[PDB]
From a paper:
CRISPR-Cas is a set of microbial adaptive immune systems characterized by the insertion of short viral- or plasmid-derived DNA fragments called spacers into the CRISPR regions in the microbe’s chromosome. However, the type II-A CRISPR-Cas systems of Streptococcus thermophilus and Streptococcus pyogenes encode four Cas proteins: Cas9; Cas1; Cas2; and Csn2, all of which are essential for adaptation in vivo (Heler et al., 2015, Wei et al., 2015). We show that the Cas9, Cas1, Cas2, and Csn2 proteins of a Streptococcus thermophilus type II-A CRISPR-Cas system form a complex and provide cryoelectron microscopy (cryo-EM) structures of three different assemblies. The structures we present here shed light on the initial stages of spacer capture and reveal an unprecedented higher order assembly of Cas1-Cas2-Csn2 proteins that appears to play a role in this process.
Finally, a filamentous form comprises monomer units (typically 2–6) assembled around a continuous DNA duplex with an interface again comprising eight Cas1 and four Cas2 subunits but in a different configuration to the dimer complex. Although the filaments were few in number, of variable in length, and less well ordered, some preliminary analysis was possible. A structure for the basic unit of the filaments, comprising two monomers and an interface between them, was obtained at 7.7-Å resolution. This filament repeat structure shows differences to the free dimers. First, the DNA running through the complex is a single continuous duplex that spans ∼70 bp. Second, the interface between monomers contains a pair of Cas14-Cas22 dimers but in a different configuration to the dimer. Attempts to morph between the two dimer complexes, to model the conformational changes required to interchange between them, revealed that the changes required were too extensive to be a simple, one-step conversion between these forms. It is therefore unclear whether the filaments can transition in some way to release dimers or whether monomers are released that then reassemble into dimers.
Residue numbers in the entry:
A (entry chain D): 1 to 219
B (entry chain P), D (entry chain O): 3 to 289
C (entry chain Q): 100 to 110
E (entry chain C): 1 to 218
Write the structure that this text describes.
């Protein structure tokens, strides 16, 4: 996952988490405007190992952390499927749940037989039980750090998003929280690209000077 | 190169694929090095790379660095422009005072004759007749100082009797600016020839790195004096732009009409060849 | 084909 | 100023509050402007600002630019308040033939003595005794040509009688590579001294432009021939890798054990100061 | 207007443009969390000149400038209602519009009667004409400097919002653009409050030290 712009000499590769610091406010604002307008503008080009350019639908742009909606139909559906798989991995728990659902179905079936009208039903499944329970992620009481962590956790659930990008999101988190975000990103394998006007101390990042020189920085 | 590139804006300069890369936040533009003759940096906010400076030294492109006031500060001088320089140093050390005083006297005669031609085009009969008399009265070693008298009468006739070369007015500032640009181009041509620029052809007592380039650039001063005389009422910025228009304008050499850079290069080549061959032919430039 | 190229204010 | 700032690594240079800011990937260093004397850039990856160039023009410090080969290419020339090195070049133009012959004979004697001593370390008594006899028989004007006679004995002793400098082989290319590195270091030192490298100590051959540095680097030449003799069986790439370790290796100067850069610097400074002062003392280097 | 939190000794007043810098990352992130949770959390309070607490509906919180859509259902509803009120203020123009709409309805009705299939229609209204024309605020923004200006225009147009708050939005704009934004805020009289992790040089701002003490700057 390499990204390239006219200011860079060679296309820079983005693997796991990547912190890109732009010291020039004009080049940073122009780069962010090229991030929002990416489908319209040909200046900023992001391509994969196949050199194929990714569509704006495949690109995930995030600026406001608390304003973004983490709960979606596809995210909640795939999450319910993941929970159903977790319950399916354990045979004993699945057997007990099947027993309880069998009892409830017996009670409701007796209540249906007591009625005068002829009634028919099918089954009560686990996905229908999770949908009836209303399982969803809670962003209401979550801190910004837990919100970004939940976004990194649900990025694997999003199928269509090729790369996640954050705009000036590193100013809220402490250095230790940034270390936790990067260390978790290395395990999640997702491709995250952060854009900050000022450099963060203690983390590896790519620095772009007002001289338009891109250099790697350990601190 | 045919092109004088002037960067007055903050930006970054890189060298990519034999191409000068101008990178800025608003736009980026690439200009080939083969078309670029002179590179001028008019501001202190420009950034450059040492690799592009090495490519400019290999391309033999004059790089000028100005100050915050935009006046030129320091220019880049390459150590070895060509291998013929080391062989030309022995010839410069073997030069004779008769050839130096003869070539310098002929050059001063060409400068005074160009001043008389400028006053003749300005329709001054007494001034151009007096400057022509000083041209016919010029002698070796310059005991009468007819060159300095021709300059004093030239500036005093053009700008008025109250005017002087020691004044701080924008007229003398533009004169020193044009003399600095032409001195930079002529000095770069002398660097292309390979001979020592610090050795002058007139006075061996005066020690200056620009002495030789000034002696070669003496006949071309009236071209700057004309635009300075026409734009004298305009502001110093517009006078500087009109001074920059001299590179775009063409002048008529004895052979044909050519650009200023080609006339300076061929003139310096004929001057060096005449110095090494002991006055075979003296190039003459007329307005 | 321009002799003087100006990158900056055009004056 | 006093300290000579040289940048051999990739880095950026800025000017803030009368303070030069040098920024490298490992650490950032700030140096006062009054402490710096001469500034040299070794590589092509260094980034500088035109504002710091203007502050250097006000500080008169000499800016030296180098190419990828490390040979100095161009230097900054201010239009006013020129550096003292330009005034020191006139003394190099005034160098007498007797001082040049004395320094040249001393250099050839040092090189031949180092070759004979190296042959003694290689435990060849006849060849080292012959080269020592040619060293004691060396005279001014070089009528005997004992240096060219000691050459064939040194190379024939090292690499065998079948080996020669004219033949094309990885040993000859390795010798030209080591001589190219030593020529780059000594040439950089001569450029730091400000003297023109085109003027050589040898009066016979002006063909080479490096003749001054090529003549100054002769006493250190055999140290390359030793590693080339040990690694002669290895491929040219491995010979280049072995020759690249000479910069990290430390050698014994007459005064104390030092790095090659400081030794070449002190030797070049003593050579220039001795040439300007007409032979006060001749720096002597022995393996 | 004034804002008050447990960290401050006394509530600080926000008038016209205001720049608030928080030198503590924990207090800044917790402050933004208190901004998004303001309805849920009672810690952060806002007291106007009337000394009355305001609901979160009256507070406009905007973090991403480019990601904030200027065209919304409520904004288009208030704009269409405003244009309908302006057209209703002039009886003659609205009468001419009713005449033209009557002519178009007569033509389309005649074409409907010419068809072999039965057709039933109701009427055409000025609101349906405005919605059919697609009247909306200009969506063209070249840079974030212009987008923030449009956000200030729509904010000054909205009467319900008593305050506009930007979180780390000053890092995109240059110092000169910040001066133009402050001058435009002083000319528009609207109340704007900025929250920045680090201080900005050259402009007047309130610096909150890690010691929790608040001090004025410039
Ligand atoms: Ca069912
Ligand atoms: Ca429920």
């Amino acid at each position: 996952m390499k990204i390239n712009f006219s200011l860079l000499d060679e296309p820079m590769e983005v693997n796991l988490g990547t912190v890109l610091v732009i010291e020039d406010v004009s080049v940073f604002a122009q780069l962010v405007k090229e991030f929002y307008q990416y489908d319209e503008q040909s200046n900023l080009t992001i391509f994969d190992s196949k050199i194929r350019s990714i569509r704006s639908s495949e690109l995930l742009l995030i600026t406001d952390i608390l304003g973004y909606d983490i709960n979606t139909s596809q995210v909640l559906k795939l999450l319910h499927t993941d929970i159903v798989s977790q319950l399916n991995d354990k045979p004993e728990v699945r057997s007990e749940i099947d027993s309880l659902v069998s009892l409830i179905t017996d009670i409701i079936m007796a209540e249906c037989i007591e009625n005068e009208l002829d009634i028919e039903y099918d089954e009560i499944t686990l996905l229908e039980l999770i949908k009836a329970l209303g399982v969803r992620i809670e962003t209401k009481s979550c801190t910004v750090f837990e919100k970004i962590f939940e976004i990194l956790q649900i990025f694997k659930y999003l199928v269509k998003k090729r790369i996640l990008v954050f705009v000036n999101s590193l100013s809220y988190f402490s250095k230790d929280e940034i270390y936790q975000i990067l260390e978790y990103t290395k395990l999640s394998q997702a491709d995250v690209l952060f854009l900050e006007p000022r450099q963060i101390e203690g983390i590896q990042q790519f620095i772009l000077d007002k001289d338009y020189i891109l250099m790697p920085y350990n601190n | 190169g045919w092109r004088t590139v002037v960067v007055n804006i903050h930006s970054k300069l890189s060298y990519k694929n034999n191409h000068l890369i101008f990178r800025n936040s608003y736009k980026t533009e690439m200009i080939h090095l083969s078309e670029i003759d002179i590179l001028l940096l008019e501001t202190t906010d420009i950034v450059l790379t040492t690799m592009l400076v090495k490519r400019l030294v290999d391309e033999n492109i004059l790089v000028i660095f100005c100050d915050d006031k935009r006046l030129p500060t320091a220019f880049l001088t390459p150590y070895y422009a060509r291998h013929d320089s080391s062989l030309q140093i022995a010839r410069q050390i073997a030069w004779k005072e008769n050839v130096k005083c003869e070539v310098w006297t002929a050059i001063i005669a060409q400068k005074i004759l160009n001043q008389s031609y400028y006053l003749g085009e300005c329709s001054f009969f007494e001034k151009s007749q007096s400057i022509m008399e000083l041209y016919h009265g010029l002698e070796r070693f310059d005991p009468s100082n007819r060159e300095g008298h021709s300059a004093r009468i030239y500036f005093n006739t053009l700008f008025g009797n109250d005017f002087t070369r020691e004044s701080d007015n924008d007229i003398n500032a533009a004169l020193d600016y044009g003399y600095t640009l032409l001195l930079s181009m002529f000095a770069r041509e002398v660097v292309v020839c390979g001979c020592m620029t610090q050795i002058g052809l007139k006075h061996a007592n005066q020690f200056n790195q620009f002495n030789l380039a000034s002696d070669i650039m003496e006949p071309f001063r009236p071209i700057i004096d004309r635009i300075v005389y026409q734009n004298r009422h305009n502001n110093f910025v517009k006078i500087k732009k009109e001074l920059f228009s001299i590179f775009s304008e063409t002048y008529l050499y004895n052979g044909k009409e050519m650009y200023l850079s080609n006339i300076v290069s061929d003139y310096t080549k004929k001057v060096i060849k005449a110095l090494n061959q002991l006055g075979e032919e003296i190039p003459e430039f007329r307005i | 084909e321009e002799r003087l190229v100006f990158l900056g204010d055009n004056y």
